Amino acid sequence: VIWGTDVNVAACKENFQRFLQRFIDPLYMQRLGEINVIGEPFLNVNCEHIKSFDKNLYRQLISYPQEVIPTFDMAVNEIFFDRYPDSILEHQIQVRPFNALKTKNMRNLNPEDIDQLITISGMVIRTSQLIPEMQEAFFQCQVCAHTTRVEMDRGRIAEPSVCGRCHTTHSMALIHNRSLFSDKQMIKLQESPEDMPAGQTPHTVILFAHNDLVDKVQPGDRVNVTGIYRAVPIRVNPRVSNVKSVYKTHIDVIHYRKTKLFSEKRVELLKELSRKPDIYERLASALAPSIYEHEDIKKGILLQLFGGTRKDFSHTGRGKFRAEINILLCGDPGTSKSQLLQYVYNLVPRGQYTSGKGSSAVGLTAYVMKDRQLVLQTGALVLSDNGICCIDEFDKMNESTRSVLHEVMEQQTLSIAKAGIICQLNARTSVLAAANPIESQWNPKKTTIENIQLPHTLLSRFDLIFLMLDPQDEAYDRRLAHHLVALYYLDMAVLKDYIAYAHSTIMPRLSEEASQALIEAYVDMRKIGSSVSAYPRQLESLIRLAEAHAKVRLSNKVEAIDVEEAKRLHREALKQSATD
Amino acid sequence: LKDYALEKEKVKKFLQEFYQDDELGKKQFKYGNQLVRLAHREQVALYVDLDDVAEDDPELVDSICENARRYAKLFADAVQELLPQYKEREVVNKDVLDVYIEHRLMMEQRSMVRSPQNQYPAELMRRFELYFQGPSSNKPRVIREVRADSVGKLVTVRGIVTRVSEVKPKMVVATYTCDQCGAETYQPIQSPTFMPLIMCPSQECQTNRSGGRLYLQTRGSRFIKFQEMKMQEHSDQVPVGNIPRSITVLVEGENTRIAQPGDHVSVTGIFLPILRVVQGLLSETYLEAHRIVKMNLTREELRQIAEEDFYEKLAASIAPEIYGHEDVKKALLLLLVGGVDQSKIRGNINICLMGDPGVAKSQLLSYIDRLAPRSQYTTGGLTAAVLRLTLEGGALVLADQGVCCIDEFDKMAEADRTAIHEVMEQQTISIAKAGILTTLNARCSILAAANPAYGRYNPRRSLEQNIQLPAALLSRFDLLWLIQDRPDRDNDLRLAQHITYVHQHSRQPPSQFEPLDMKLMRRYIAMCREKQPMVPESLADYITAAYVEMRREAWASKDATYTSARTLLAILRLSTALARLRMVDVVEKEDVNEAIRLMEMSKDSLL
Ligand SMILES: Nc1ncnc2c1ncn2[C@@H]1O[C@H](COP(=O)(O)OP(=O)(O)OP(=O)(O)O)[C@@H](O)[C@H]1O
Ligand SMILES: Nc1ncnc2c1ncn2[C@@H]1O[C@H](COP(=O)(O)OP(=O)(O)OP(=O)(O)O)[C@@H](O)[C@H]1O
Ligand SMILES: [Mg+2]
Ligand SMILES: [Mg+2]
Ligand SMILES: [Zn+2]
Ligand SMILES: [Zn+2]
């Protein structure tokens, strides 16, 4: 056995071969046959399968990845030469295990894990161009051009300092092109914010992809990366050989996974509470309990949380459809706008909170900065590709950021001209903006555009503009005071689980009754506007809201009740920003 | 002067034969059970309480204090010898280091006189860590008192963490494998840096003179979690005319990730030098941490507390030399006593003082910084930072339930403004230097001072017109006081008389109540912090009535007076702070009325 382990090459290979052949959900042989035609020599294996089949083999694999993976490679190559014994491949099959030890508490990582295979979920923050690293340096004498080679000189290259044919002094210089290189890509990946319990200091890790699996993860992608934990010394000065007693650590990736829920009890419970006739109203009430007397705004933000159903219009040639719901809460200071924004950001997973001011710690834009490598840094919008971007103080923004917001709300993507290349980062986010009117208070008789001073197009992109004000009503003040004092002297968890289940499983689809109701409502709106009239964008908003409401009810199909609720909510928002 | 073998015998006897009756008087060997758990790999760190040692051998404790590293090693060796005896189950070989150790032991036992070098280092037979807890007899030592004389002695200090580095793996026993002999080489490491070995010292290669070149391997080697932090003198112990001093602390093992910046902690550890030459070598010192723990009168005194004017008296004691500003002083006292946070409610009472130059604002801020137990003073850094790779708490973090007095507020950077806005909204500071949003707990009352731009305040110009601060930011503050230096011959004459008396006697003019000594004020403040008064539902009716009345008045007022729910929250906070001052667990009509009066007086000060 290899020193300091429990590993036998022959026995380990035989056990891996047995696992490949004798298994029940055989998938490995199926994908071996698939690789035959495809030619893709990378056999991905879920380590949990080995754990179930043989826990001892799984433990052995985790403990000594570097020494065990080659045995699996050899076994797979022998099998491929057994099944389909005749075939052509530039390099024999390779195995890249994954999903083995979800020690995703990156903040909780220990030196005991050094040189052990581990899988961690997170969002890649930055990358770099593939680095060619030498593996067989080639040298030629300045005097006599005596060619020589130095192979795998343990990272560094051993300069001969003396020739071998004229045996002159140190005159043999390296020839870069004649040498041999391998691909090594560096990635900086941040720990997934959701998994962190406290998240006081999000953790970051460095990954190296070697000889393959390069450029397979773009910046901002949320993936599960499985690789070997590594610790390497850092020299105090390159000239001297002294090394720090504290090692810097990184990961050598082995596999990338781009990315049921709970148990039967949770699905049963959510279905049961869905059966309630007033589940919509009850869910609205549960959302943001601190707030008071706001119902239409709460229902709108809830529908935004659920959002419309994802739809594929690639065949139709109409381009991507904005299934997300964008809501702008416009109100005077002290109407609890920021409280709602924070609460929504504190509830939805993978949500992002930002301020319209350029001083915001996050920033609503992405840009290239020197490391001194000019690498891209993502913005809040790109960061929350499928989450919810709660923008506060949305009124105060620069024209460039306004154009960026218009672009992202229109095409669901952000165009960045890095160097000379234009990159379209997909950002299908749900924008929840909050705006406070200019001046101390909101001047009535002035349109929201006049009193907020934002482009008409940009606000027309929003599918719901909710106007909230502090009425000069003594009764309202008394009620609010009673509510606050009572707060002085349904848990969010179940709501979050319900939203997650709705997003994961259900996908509302239109219905003939719903179609006719939509058409009738739109023509009625048109007729009303015959005497800010109706626009087809309003129809898109209505259909999206109806789909979201159906998702809330878990109907899986848009229903006339959903159409009625969507129309009523849209009319309420219209009234809120209406004037005449 | 003493036989360390005898010391090893004594420590083994102590560990074997120490028992303190646990829950329900259960006679249990407190350290025997821990030894069992260590033998089963169920524990990693074994903290030893020097009080227990003092239970039967004060001399041993004194020797440990006089020399700590030696006795730490002695205890570690004793535990290493004892562990096999207490082992009872062949626990699953956790990690790879356990199996590696098992293989090494099997090979060694598969062997006789042998050279001292040709044996495994003790530190390689490990994964049990030892630490000491300082005796109750030894009082905590101020950082300034820890000098070169105490180097090598176990000491307990108390301070505030100012920065902590990320956990990293530090090598303890480097392991190398030769190229020819197939043996193994080991290298204990104590220095922060080391020279990796090159040619193996193996007997086989030496005899065969093969010149086998060693290759370092991480799997064989042994690492330990490591963190470098800086602990600063807590403001209570700092001399009046000095500044806090800092001590570097090297946390390792299980002690890692047990402290955060701004934490008021107590550290027991060994004070040792690090040599990273006038009449001898010169070295920098540090503190090898062992235990880190995050910390949180006469009858006449009570009679004075019972006095109705008591509170007023305390107001008179807030910077007595500052003539006038009585209500401002009262508000400052309310800030000092803070809220209650009954559950949770933000208990910090943020106050801002906007005024023309030369109205004692800075002096007031300085006095508050001197009186508040935990205090920070700044002018506009304030927020945390990421130094180069370590978090460094700013003044706001250093407050951490204290009070941050920010003079010259109007000259603060916009980013700092946003930061303080976040501090007043969530009591947390979000900072990102490398695209990482780190959130730190900064829960601290804020006392800001600002000056109107372009000279003295112009009454004819509305707020934010004579000042260059966002209106919303001002509305965040619970109390906003405008101080105007209106020339009034009577009042000006009074002030002049006061100043002249001060200059002629180095003391303020005599008053009705003599100002109380700062220490007594602090004591009373803490006593008030003890209470957490409630708000009876009955009082709610009156509070709501008052709120609706004042809001109606604001609507009647042509100029908006920032009235909102924030105002009601502030009213409640002030009422509960006054209740704390009264030492009564139930608010009273009196307190509510007084809070309302203060709020009205602020808004009038904006007149
Ligand atoms: N209708 C309401 N129901 C419940 N609470 C309310 C209501 N209106 C205001 N509040 C309370 O008033 C305070 C408003 O604070 P917040 O900072 O969220 O206000 P905002 O209107 O978003 O402010 P701004 O626009 O100045 O940023 C919070 O305590 C909020 O709970
Ligand atoms: N109301 C007052 N009572 C007593 N002394 C006062 C008063 N107002 C100002 N002074 C005296 O004014 C002197 C100088 O002005 P001071 O230090 O108070 O300025 P300041 O208000 O802090 O100004 P700024 O914020 O513009 O720097 C101080 O020594 C202080 O004693
Ligand atoms: Mg707000
Ligand atoms: Mg001053
Ligand atoms: Zn030559
Ligand atoms: Zn050798």
- Reading the block at residue B15, the tokens are 């560990």
Q: How far, in Å, from the CA of A163 to the mean position of ligand 5?
A: 5
Phi, psi of B374 (to 5 degrees): -100, 115
Burial B58-86 (b: 16+ CB within 10 A, else e): eebbebbbeebeebbebbbbbbeebbeeb
| Best residue for ligand 2 mutational test, from B325, B329, B362 (most atoms within 8 Å of Cβ) | B362
- β-pairing verdict for A430-435 and A327-331: parallel
Best CA proximity match to A191, nearest among A175, A205, A179: A205
Give the type of residue at B245: R
In angstroms, the CA A492 to CA A498 distance is 10
Q: How many CA atoms lie within 13 A of B137 on its CB side?
A: 12
Strands A327-331 and A464-468: parallel
Count chain A–chain B contacts defined by CB atoms under 8 A. Answer: 161
Task: Round the CA-based radius of gyration of chain B to a whole number and report it.
Answer: 32
- Nearest alpha carbon, ligand 2 atom 5: B322
Q: Do B391 and A484 touch (CB under 8 A)?
A: no
Ligand 1 touching residue A333 (CB < 6 A): yes
**Which residues of A fall within a CB distance of 8 Å from B441?**
200
CA B200 to CA B187: how far, in whole Å? 11
Q: What letter would DSSP give residue A67?
A: H
Are A112 and A63 in contact, with CB atoms under 8 Å apart? no
Kindly list the distances between the CA atom of residue A575 and the CA atoms of A80, A346, B558, in Å, as whole numbers in the listed order: 70, 29, 28
Nearest residue (by CA) to ligand 1, atom 25, is A333
Partner B contacted by A155 (CB < 8 A): no
**Is residue A44 a contact partner of residue A96, using CB atoms and an 8 Å limit?**
yes
Strands A243-244 and B193-194, sheet pairing: antiparallel
How far apart are alpha carbons B178 and B198 in whole angstroms? 9
- Tally Cβ neighbours within 10 Å of residue A258: 9
Could you give the CA distance from residue B462 to residue B445 in angstroms, rounded to a whole number? 27
Residues in chain A within 8 Å Cβ distance of B224: 111
Residue A267, H or E segment: helix A264-275
How many angstroms separate the CA atoms of A110 and A99, rounded? Answer: 19
Locate the ligand 2 atom nearest the alpha carbon of residue B485 and give its number. Answer: 8
Cβ <8 Å between B224 and A199: no
End-to-end CA distance of chain A: 87
Q: Do residues A434 and A394 lie in contact, with contact meaning Cβ atoms separated by under 8 Å? A: yes
B360 is in an annotated binding site: yes
- Looking at the DSSP bridge assignments, the partners of residue B124 are none
Backbone angles phi, psi at A60, to 5 degrees: -65, -40
DSSP string across B25-70: GEEE-HHHHHHHHHHTT--SEEEEEHHHHHTT-HHHHHHHHH-HHH
Q: Is the dihedral of CA B299, B305, B310, B313 positive or negative?
A: positive
Residue at A250: amino acid letter: H
Helix (H) or strand (E) holding A327: strand A327-331
Beta bridge partners of B293: B266
Structure tokens at A505: 């499983």
> Other CB atoms closer than 10 Å to residue B108's CB: what's the count?
12
Q: Which atom of ligand 2 is nearest to the CA of B356?
A: 26
3-state secondary structure of B426: helix
Nearest alpha carbon to residue A46 among A119, A110, A111: A119
A202–B436 CB contact, under 8 Å:
yes
Asked if the C-beta of A493 comes within 8 angstroms of chain B's C-beta atoms, the answer is no
Residue B4 in contact with partner chain A when CB distance is under 8 A: no
B323 marked as part of a ligand binding site = yes
Q: Is B472 in the pocket of ligand 1 (CB under 6 A)?
A: yes
Contacts of B168 in chain A (CB under 8 A): 246-249
Q: At B360, list the tokens.
A: 């004692």
Please enumerate in sequence order all residues whose Cβ is within 8 A of that of B231, keeping only pairs 6 or more positions apart, or say none: B143, B157, B159, B160, B161, B162, B246, B247, B249, B265, B267, B287
CA nearest ligand 1 atom 24, residue: A333
A335 lines ligand 1 (CB under 6 A): yes
Shortest CA distance to A570 belongs to which of A381, A262, A257, A327? A327
Q: Please tell me the distance in Å from B189's CA to the nearest CA on chain A.
A: 8
A108 secondary structure, DSSP code = S
Q: Do B438 and A202 touch (CB under 8 A)?
A: yes
Q: Are strands B264-274 and B154-165 parallel, antiparallel or unpaired?
A: antiparallel
Separation CA B320–CA B514 (nearest Å): 9
Query: A337 CB under 6 A from ligand 1?
Result: yes
Q: Are A404 and A382 in contact (CB under 8 A)?
A: no
Residue in B182, B189, B172, B191 with CA at minimum distance from that of residue B214 = B182
Partner A, chain B 236-265, Cβ-Cβ below 8 Å: 260
Containing A540, the helix (H) or strand (E) segment is helix A536-553
Distance of alpha carbon A337 from alpha carbon A340, whole angstroms: 5
Q: Quote the distance between the C-alpha of residue A70 and its chain's center.
A: 33
Long-range CB pairs of B522-528 (<8 Å, 24+ gap) are B522/B371, B522/B373, B523/B297, B524/B305, B524/B314, B525/B336, B525/B337, B525/B371, B525/B373, B526/B373, B527/B305, B527/B583, B528/B337, B528/B580, B528/B581, B528/B583
**Cβ contact, residue pair B97, A112, below 8 Å:** yes
Contact B540 A359 (CB under 8 A): no
The interface residues of chain A toward chain B in range 222-241, judged by CB-CB distance below 8 A, are 230-231, 233, 236, 241
With an 8 Å Cβ cutoff, are B425 and A338 in contact?
A: yes
State the sign of the Cα–Cα–Cα–Cα dihedral A100, A102, A104, A107.
negative
Query: Hey, what are A353's tokens?
Result: 């909170």
B127 vs B177, B191, B223, B265, CA distance in Å?
22, 20, 10, 26
B574 CB burial (10 A radius; 0-12, 13-18, 19+):
buried
Helix (H) / strand (E) containing B216: strand B215-233
Contact B429, B384 (CB under 8 A): yes
Other beta carbons within 10 angstroms of residue A88's beta carbon come to: 5
Q: Is A518 exposed, middle or buried (0-12, 13-18, 19+ CB in 10 A)?
A: buried
- Crossing angle of the two packed helices B565-582 and A474-488, in degrees rounded to 10: 40
- Chain B contacts in chain A segment 12-71 (CB below 8 A): 63-64
Which residues on chain B are in Cβ contact (under 8 Å) with A370? Answer: none
Q: How far is the CA of B197 from the centre of ligand 6 (A)?
A: 12
- Other Cβ atoms within 10 Å of A285 Cβ, number: 14
What distance in Å separates the CA atoms of residue B139 and residue B305, rounded to the nearest whole number? 32
Q: How far is B447 from chain A (nearest CA, A)?
A: 22
Q: How many helices and strands, by DSSP H and E, does chain A display?
A: 18, 20
Query: Which residues contact residue B421 at a Cβ distance below 8 angstroms, ignoring those fewer than 6 apart?
Result: B472, B473, B476
Residue of B496, B497, B603, B503 whose CA lies nearest to B553: B603
User: Using N-to-C axis directions, what is the helix angle for A536-553 and A279-286, rounded to 10°?
Assistant: 90
Return d(Cα B449, Cα B427) in angstroms, integer: 20
CB B440 within 8 A of CB B448: no
Q: Cα–Cα distance between A384 and A379 in angstroms, integer?
A: 9
Is residue A293 in contact with ligand 1, taking CB distance under 6 Å? yes
User: Are A488 and B226 a contacting pair at CB < 8 A?
Assistant: no
- The answer to whether the Cβ–Cβ distance between A5 and B415 falls below 8 Å is no
The residue type of B301 is E
Between CA B249 and CA B162 the distance in angstroms is 11
Search chain B and give the residue with CA nearest A7. B99
Residue B440: closest C-alpha in chain A: A200
> Both tokens of residue B80?
């290493």
Q: Which residues contact B132 (CB under 8 A, 6 or more apart)?
A: B47, B48, B50, B64, B68, B72, B154, B268, B290, B291
User: Distances from the Cα of A382 to the Cαs of A126, A238, A323, A412, A415, in angstroms?
Assistant: 13, 39, 16, 10, 11
**Under 8 Å between Cβ of B231 and B161:** yes
Give the residue among A69, A202, A442 at the shortest CA–CA distance from B560: A442
Angstrom distance (rounded) from CA A255 to CA A120: 11
A96 lines ligand 1 (CB under 6 A): no
CB B508 within 8 A of CB B498: yes
Q: Are B362 and B404 in contact (CB under 8 A)?
A: no
A334, A359, A485 member nearest B540 (Cβ): A485
Scanning every residue of chain B, which has its alpha carbon at the shortest distance from the alpha carbon of A1?
Answer: B103
Note whether A358 contacts B: Cβ–Cβ < 8 A: no
CA–chain centroid gap for B80, Å, is 35
Q: At what angle do helices B58-66 and B4-16 cross, to 10 degrees?
A: 130
Interface test with B, best of A60, A117, A245 (most B CBs within 10 A): A245
B322 lines ligand 2 (CB under 6 A): yes
Q: In one letter, which amino acid is A393?
A: E
Residue B406 alpha carbon to ligand 4 centre in Å: 10
Rounded Cα gap, residues A358 and A396, in angstroms: 9
Considering only CB atoms, B418 lies closest to which of A3, A357, A441, namely A357
Q: Which of B321, B362, B363, B506 to mutate to test the pocket of ligand 2 (most atoms within 8 A of CB)?
A: B363
Nearest to B262 by CA among B289, B285, B287, B229: B229
Cα dihedral sign for A434, A438, A442, A448? negative
Can you say which residues of A are annotated as belonging to the binding site for ATP? 292, 318, 337-338, 436, 461, 537, 540
At B393 the three-state DSSP class reads coil
Rounded to 10°, the helix A296-306/A536-553 angle is: 80
Residue for token digits 């397979």?
Answer: A216
Cα B230 to Cα A404: distance, rounded to the nearest angstrom? 43
Quote the tokens at residue B445: 């009352």
Note the helical H segments in B40-153.
50-54, 58-66, 68-86, 95-109
Distance CA B603, CA B477 (A): 12
The CA distances from residue B199 to B124, B209, B213, in Å, are 21, 11, 4
DSSP H or E stretch at residue B130: strand B129-133
CA distances from B550 to A96, B322, B597 (A): 70, 31, 11
Helix H or strand E segment including B582: helix B565-582
